[PDB]
Each structure stands twice: as structure tokens, then as C-alpha cells.
Amino acid sequence: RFYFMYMARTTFQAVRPLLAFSVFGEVMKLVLATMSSGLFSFLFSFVLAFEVFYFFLQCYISYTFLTMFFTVLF
Amino acid sequence: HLYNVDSTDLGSAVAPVRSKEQLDRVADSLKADLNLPGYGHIPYKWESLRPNPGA
Numbered sequence A: 001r002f003y004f005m006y007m008a009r010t011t012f013q014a015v016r017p018l019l020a021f022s023v024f025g026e027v028m029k030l031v032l033a034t035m036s037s038g039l040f041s042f043l044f045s046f047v048l049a050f051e052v053f054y055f056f057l058q059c060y061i062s063y064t065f066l067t068m069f070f071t072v073l074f
Numbered sequence B: 001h002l003y004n005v006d007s008t009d010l011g012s013a014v015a016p017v018r019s020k021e022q023l024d025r026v027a028d029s030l031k032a033d034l035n036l037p038g039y040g041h042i043p044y045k046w047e048s049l050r051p052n053p054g055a
């Protein structure tokens, strides 16, 4: 069972950035497709920037957990 | 029997008085009698902070 647990954890930590980049991207794309005015767009630019920062945070977390999971003593 | 009427009262001898309430009443009655799904629908509205651009 430990092998299954480990592979699950590894795959989750590996796909975390892909999710942050793809599904939240689809949400942003829905919003872009639906919005027309200028005030809402001005306010949504900051959401896009926050998504940038969140993607970088997820990438850092994944890097940390992956260097923990792929570190061998011998 | 010579006239096309249901009763003997042919209405008032003076025209109505202008009234927002009477106008709204008549408009609502006409809308109900027509029963048209699509009245008041606005497919495109000029984008503006004002609710009704122009009017």
C-alpha cells in the first residue's frame, strides 16, 4: 500500500502546477469571453496577476516536495 | 337593434384626463391580452455606467 500512497502523492505534487495553469486558466478565459466593459476589465487584470503569482507559488511548493521525494541517501 | 352594441351606455361624453396610472393600466392590459414572450427583451445595450444610454 505504501507504493500506491507514494505514487499518489508524487502525481498530485507533479500535476499541481499543471492544474493551476490549465483549469484556473479556463476560468479566466470564461471571464474574458463574457466580459465587455472597461471597469470590470480593469478589476480583472489584478485577478490575472494574482493567478500569475499563485502559479509561481504552486511551482515552488512542487519543487520543494519533489526534491524531498527524489532525494536518496545512497 | 339598429346599433352594434351590447348595452345602452356608449361611454362618457368627455375625453379622459391624462394620468400616468391610467396609461400604465392600459399598457398592462394590452400586454396581458397580447401575451408575447419577447417584449422588453434587449439583445444589445450600449455599454455605459448609465442604465439607459441615451433615453
Ligand SMILES: CCCCCCCCCCCCCCCCCC(=O)OC[C@H](COP(=O)([O-])OCC(O)COP(=O)([O-])OC[C@@H](COC(=O)CCCCCCCCCCCCCCCCC)OC(=O)CCCCCCCCCCCCCCCCC)OC(=O)CCCCCCCCCCCCCCCCC
Pocket: A036, A037, A038, A039, A042, B047, B048, B049, B050
Ligand atoms: C499617455 C497619455 C495619457 C494616457 C491616459 C489617458 C486616459 C485618461 C483617462 C483614464 C480613466 C479611464 C477610466 C478607467 C475606469 C474604467 C472606465 C473605462 O475605462 O471605460 C472607458 C473606456 C471603455 O468604456 P466602455 O467600455 O464603453 O464602458 C463604459 C464607458 O467607458 C463609460 O460609460 P459612459 O458611456 O456612460 O460615459 C460617457 C461619457 C462619460 O464621461 C463624460 O461624460 C465626460 C468625461 C470627460 C471629463 C473631462 C474632464 C473634466 C474636467 C473638469 C475640470 C475642468 C476645468 C479644469 C481643466 C481645464 C483644462 C485646461 O464619456 C466617456 O465615457 C468618456 C470616457 C473617455 C475614455 C478615455 C479616452 C482616452 C482613451 C485613451 C487615450 C490614449 C492616448 C494615447 C496613449 C499613449 C500611450 C503610449 O475605455 C477606455 O477609455 C480605456 C482607457 C485606457 C487608457 C490607456 C492609457 C494609455 C495606456 C497605454 C497602454 C499600452 C497599450 C495601449 C494600446 C496602444 C499602445 C500604443
Ligand SMILES: CCCCCCCCCCCCCCCCCC(=O)OC[C@H](COP(=O)([O-])OCC[N+](C)(C)C)OC(=O)CCCCCCCCCCCCCCCCC
Pocket: A017, A056, A059, A060, A062, A063, A066, A067, A070
Ligand atoms: C527536482 C525537479 C523539480 C522540478 C520542478 C518543476 C516545477 C515547475 C515546472 C513548471 C514548468 C512550466 C513551464 C512551461 C509553461 C510555459 C510554456 C511556455 O514557455 O510558453 C511559451 C512562451 C510564451 O510564448 P508567448 O505567450 O509569448 O506566445 C507564443 C506562445 N505559444 C507558442 C504557446 C502560443 O515562450 C516564451 O517566449 C517565454 C519566454 C519568457 C520566459 C518564460 C519562462 C518563465 C515562466 C515559466 C516559469 C515556470 C517555472 C517556475 C519555476 C519556479 C521554481 C522556484
